[PDB]
Design a protein around this ligand. Structure first.
Ligand SMILES: [Cl-]
Ligand code: NA
Ligand code: NA
Ligand SMILES: [Zn+2]
Length: 56
């Protein structure tokens, strides 16, 4: 299934989609993406829209 990430960093910003088996796998992928970019903050997940956000 397709999941979305909105990455709202101070100087790094993005919207991504990933194909993942389930939400736990999407979360894993997106958390690793944000961590490699040095972006951490408040995380959100909305199952109805299959959307994660991270805001610094
Ligand atoms: Cl895994
Ligand atoms: Na930042
Ligand atoms: Na989790
Ligand atoms: Zn796995």
């Amino acid at each position: 299934m397709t999941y979305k990430l909105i990455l709202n960093g101070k100087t790094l910003k993005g919207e991504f989609t990933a194909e993942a088996h389930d939400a736990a796998h999407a979360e894993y992928i997106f958390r690793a993406l944000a961590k490699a970019q040095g972006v951490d903050g408040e995380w959100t997940y909305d199952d109805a829209t299959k959307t994660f956000t991270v805001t610094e």
